[PDB]
Amino acid sequence: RGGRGFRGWWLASTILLLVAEKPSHGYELAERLAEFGIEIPGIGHMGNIYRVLADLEESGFLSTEWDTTVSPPRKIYRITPQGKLYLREILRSLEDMKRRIETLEERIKRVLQE
Template identity: 30%
Template sequence: MTQGQAKGIGLVELRRGVLVLAVLSQLRERQYGYSLRQALVDGGMPVEEGTLYPLLRRLEAQGLLTSEWDTATAPPRRYYRLNAEGSDALAELAKAWRAQVEAIHGFLGDA
């Protein structure tokens, strides 16, 4: 494995781990898929539709999101939002994230 391949694998794994936290953080407010994708892009975390929509379905199946169709708009849009369980999960993940960031800062020092 080359250095570039190792770097790519590491970045993919890192992004996969933080994408759930990023998505949950953006769904404190009701959003449809495209607006969520744009919010992530604007925040520096671009994500492909082929990654985002399956993740939204999985989070909803896990009971962290609710969704509803708005047919009053053209085209109809499916809106997602955190439910109570999702808000709790976001709080727990945010706490764990902050602890991990602190630990990594200690490991990296001035690197």
């Protein structure tokens, strides 16, 4: 079985986006996911791209079509209109998260002034 928690959410979210930005296969996604990395304490990683792709596909946020012009053939993932709606839900939560970080930032500056 797979990875969960915040890292889980942050991986799915990032993968969906990277797919929205350019439809692609598992292997290439990994490269763009690597150069993603982390400004986020403790997360890393990143890892099973393939299985969260299959997961986002099963859930209908992504569709698939084989590119047979290359060898070996590569299965291309593409965002669906549902996947875009799931994305707006991630977007609103990123705005939640960002507001929460800024309330801490200020709280901290106040005790550092003190």
